[PDB]
Amino acid sequence: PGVQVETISPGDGRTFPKRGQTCVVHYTGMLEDGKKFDSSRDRNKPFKFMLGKQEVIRGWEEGVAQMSVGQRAKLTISPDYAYGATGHPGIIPPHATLVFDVELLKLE
Ligand SMILES: CO[C@H]1C[C@@H](C)C/C(C)=C/[C@@H](CC(C)=O)C(=O)C[C@H](O)[C@@H](C)[C@@H](/C(C)=C/[C@@H]2CC[C@@H](O)[C@H](OC)C2)OC(=O)[C@@H]2CCCCN2C(=O)C(=O)[C@]2(O)O[C@H]1[C@@H](OC)C[C@H]2C
Ligand SMILES: [Cl-]
Ligand SMILES: [Cl-]
Ligand code: NA
């Protein structure tokens, strides 16, 4: 599948992201073996995005939509729902499944 969502700690079970809302998160991005390539946590600054604008990889678009506010989850994202056969220069190899540890902090 494009994304698999595995819950680390539950959310509110009620408030799920909608178009027009700003999702505020912390994340750590890694390969399937846990090797870290990026983290907002390390910058002590949350990351913000919105649905429906093609501004995040599709695995986030579909994974975070399945999370409720407060939830922490592991999103395992297939290459086609991330950087595909190309990868990301300097950061992620070709054909890489990505794992993001994401905390959905709030909707604004
Ligand atoms: C430290 O910078 C990070 C981005 C951010 C914090 C800084 C901004 C606002 C940069 C601007 C620079 C700019 C010129 O606008 C930017 O790139 C914004 C953009 O929306 C990103 C937020 C988005 C992304 C790269 C979308 C692509 C847009 C093009 C489409 O074709 C692509 O489809 C395949 C998808 O990121 C994502 O979807 C995913 C999921 C959310 C968390 C980040 N993501 C990751 O994969 C990471 O962990 C990664 O390390 O995060 C860093 C990132 O640098 C560029 C490389 C990637 C590997
Ligand atoms: Cl935003
Ligand atoms: Cl925006
Ligand atoms: Na943008």
Beta 3-9 vs 72-77: how paired, if at all?
antiparallel
Count the alpha carbons within 13 Å of 75 in the hemisphere toward its beta carbon.
29
Residue 72: both structure tokens together? 């922490």
Confirm or reject: Cβ of 99 under 6 Å from ligand 1. no
Whether 16 is a known active-site residue: answer no
Q: Which of 35, 37, 57 to mutate to test the pocket of ligand 1 (most atoms within 8 A of CB)?
A: 57
C-alpha distance from residue 70 to each of 38, 44, 100 (Å): 21, 17, 16
Catalytic position from the list 16, 38, 47, 49? 38
The distance of Cα 5 from the centroid of its chain, to the nearest Å, equals 10
